[PDB]
Design a protein around this ligand. Structure first.
Ligand SMILES: CCCCCCCCCCC(CCCCCCCCCC)(CO[C@@H]1O[C@H](CO)[C@@H](O[C@H]2O[C@H](CO)[C@@H](O)[C@H](O)[C@H]2O)[C@H](O)[C@H]1O)CO[C@@H]1O[C@H](CO)[C@@H](O[C@H]2O[C@H](CO)[C@@H](O)[C@H](O)[C@H]2O)[C@H](O)[C@H]1O
Ligand SMILES: CCCCCCCCCCC(CCCCCCCCCC)(CO[C@@H]1O[C@H](CO)[C@@H](O[C@H]2O[C@H](CO)[C@@H](O)[C@H](O)[C@H]2O)[C@H](O)[C@H]1O)CO[C@@H]1O[C@H](CO)[C@@H](O[C@H]2O[C@H](CO)[C@@H](O)[C@H](O)[C@H]2O)[C@H](O)[C@H]1O
Ligand SMILES: CC(C)CCC[C@@H](C)[C@H]1CC[C@H]2[C@@H]3CC=C4C[C@@H](OC(=O)CCC(=O)O)CC[C@]4(C)[C@H]3CC[C@]12C
Ligand SMILES: [Zn+2]
Ligand SMILES: [Zn+2]
Ligand SMILES: [Zn+2]
Ligand SMILES: [Zn+2]
Ligand SMILES: [Zn+2]
Ligand SMILES: [Zn+2]
Ligand SMILES: [Zn+2]
Ligand SMILES: [Zn+2]
Lengths: 325, 323
């Protein structure tokens, strides 16, 4: 399953190579800036790949009792947070550009690199649209946002090429809205085409792309936080399980019951319940195990308790604030 | 603290606005650090509010006590992302250098940042806890201050018609296509390489120091959050001590993880010998855990084969049941 990540990384490196070649042949720092921008996506792909590689190992090592299966969701959360930070930086840059306008040069090469990146991201997203792994969904969202930004840049460059006249101080081109550098040397001791309508196009496109990306990734962040913060997921309700356990004649009371998911469908519940007599403890244990298996529970550690007090067992002395919840 | 948090947030907003209006990479890094700090304060306040009346809500039986460490990790990751963005900006500045407008405004902003950083940890547990943070913030502000001072002290700019503009430095239409077309005033740039390189090198050093400082916190948060044994407990020694107990003969499904802080969770699965008694051994194993860092014990005993655990269900356990 790592082949998709590997080929995505290879495509990113190929894009880096073509972008740096274009920068060298055209002597434009904008291509280098674009390569640095795509380095964030390359890093996200590397994070996804290493997360998958560590998820491939579930041998219950010395330090990790459960195993590094949680690394998948943790890396998904890290990638989502990195995408959010990149969006915040992009929003700051967009605000600065709206305050301080800045055009672009060599629209042909810009369009070529933009459409190349758009094709790369489309190929990546089509392969990633096979959809269960939350990290895969996060990387898919990230790639979709990238693609949206790339196509927005392509459209902005194309519409800029359609109507805009460059100048070499021979003819007055920049509109009065755009501040000339040092008043063009006091006007050296046509007014172009599309003075300011095209100027607002790129900020609007990038901010709407950022908003769409944030709205699409917010459910991913919510799911990652809910699963990671040890909260009961859907299809499992504490009230229904408590009712289905209490009415069982084997148990007498239920207390200290904790339910947290491990990864995806892997969920573990711990119950500390009290029983009447040791006789037929398997009959009670088998019954409650079957009831839990009826719900989403498959693995659990249910502690029988034998005889007012909240729990027969407790921490040494009256020390508190160390017991769970 | 809340008023201090609001004041720091306002100062960070003004610093970000000033950096945007002046393209100051060092000021941008200082504002990023201030933003990270204010979000850390917001996360701490949210955690305190949540834990003020934390209970076993239907959403989480285990409680929301992990929110503090989770928010700390989110703040750390956000700071790392902003730092990588700043590093990319510094690389771009290496490719495309820029010259700042008003060094005096930058110097004033840096002085104000130093003052607010000093005032931060002055208000106790806070002083001892954040002395290192105050020192680091002071160093970061001082870096920006000295960079701005060096820029203002020696740089000579071609505000009017003069030849001091560096041809290697980008120029408007190549000095407006050599607008003067003659010998201009060779006021010189006063070592532009010595000058223009100061800000990017300074911000690179600052972000390197920031990552060096925040990295151990990131590893601590990652270890605490993802299910890992605490540094104060040895798994092999603990299980060897547990197996010494007469009641238990073998163990399976042994899991240890910690909620947050000093909270410890331990799960056991004991085959036992005589399930009828269950006395003088449950207390024994409870004491066995408690003499170690465990305080919350969930040691469920199995009652008696070839199968590791008799209680068990479908094969889905392979993909559902914990190892
Ligand atoms: C996506 C993130 C994964 C994070 C976890 C990485 C685990 C590996 C790094 C080392 C560490 C975690 C330190 C984490 C610091 C923060 C890292 C960055 C976090 C934010 C991004 C776990 O320490 C090692 O971890 C190894 C994990 O496999 C494992 O050793 C294995 O090694 C080989 C593996 O191939 C394997 O050949 C070998 O047989 C195993 O012995 C053991 O647990 C241990 O030796 C150190 O503690
Ligand atoms: C850059 C941003 C990145 C993403 C940041 C996270 C965004 C997602 C937050 C998610 C999240 C956990 C995180 C808690 C804060 C942890 C530190 C975060 C630090 C961030 C820097 C918010 O947490 C919820 O927030 C609620 C706010 O009112 C509040 O719930 C209050 O009202 C509740 C309803 O009536 C109710 O439970 C109760 O009446 C209150 O308890 C509680 O704080 C909590 O339940 C959980 O949200 C879930 O949403 C559910 C459906 O909507 C909904 O049920 C709850 O909302 C919550 O189960
Ligand atoms: C090029 C950019 C992206 C990063 C430039 C800085 C890194 C090369 C430095 C900054 C902090 C360094 C880390 C700081 C501390 C440690 C711990 C140390 O390794 C251990 O885990 C030993 C025990 C310990 O000291 O915690 C040495 C490697 C490492 C990860 C360092 C690896 C190199 C890092 C990431
Ligand atoms: Zn991306
Ligand atoms: Zn099952
Ligand atoms: Zn009890
Ligand atoms: Zn509890
Ligand atoms: Zn600070
Ligand atoms: Zn204890
Ligand atoms: Zn068993
Ligand atoms: Zn297990």
């Amino acid at each position: 399953n790592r082949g998709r990540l590997l080929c995505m990384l290879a495509l990113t490196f190929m894009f880096m190579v073509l972008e740096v070649v274009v920068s060298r042949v055209t002597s434009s720092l904008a291509m280098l800036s674009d390569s640095f921008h795509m380095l964030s996506d390359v890093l996200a792909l590397v994070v996804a790949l290493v997360a998958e590689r560590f998820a491939r190992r579930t041998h219950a090592t010395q330090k990790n009792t459960f195993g590094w299966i949680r690394a998948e969701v943790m890396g998904a959360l890290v990638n989502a947070i990195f995408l959010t930070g990149l969006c915040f930086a992009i929003l700051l840059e967009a605000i600065e550009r709206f305050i301080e306008p800045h055009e672009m040069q060599q629209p042909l090469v810009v369009l070529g690199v933009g459409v190349a990146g758009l094709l790369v991201n489309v190929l990546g997203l089509c392969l990633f649209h096979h959809h269960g792994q939350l990290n895969m969904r996060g990387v898919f969202l990230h790639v979709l946002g990238d693609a949206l930004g790339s196509v927005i840049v392509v459209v902005n460059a194309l519409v800029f090429y359609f109507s805009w006249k460059g100048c070499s101080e021979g003819d007055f081109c920049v509109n009065p809205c755009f501040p000339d550098p040092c008043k063009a040397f006091v006007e050296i001791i046509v007014y172009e085409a599309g003075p300011c309508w095209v100027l607002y196009l790129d900020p609007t496109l990038c901010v709407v792309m950022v908003c769409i990306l944030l709205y699409t990734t917010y459910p991913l962040l919510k799911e990652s936080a809910l699963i990671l913060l040890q909260t009961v997921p859907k299809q499992i309700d504490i009230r229904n399980l408590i009712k289905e356990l209490r009415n069982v004649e084997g148990v007498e009371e239920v207390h200290e019951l904790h339910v947290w998911q491990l990864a995806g469908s892997r969920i573990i519940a711990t119950a500390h319940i009290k029983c009447e007599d040791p006789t037929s403890y398997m009959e009670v244990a088998k019954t409650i195990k079957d009831v839990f298996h009826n719900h989403g529970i498959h693995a659990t550690t249910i502690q029988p308790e034998f005889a007012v007090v909240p729990c027969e067992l407790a921490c040494r002395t009256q020390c508190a604030l160390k017991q769970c919840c």
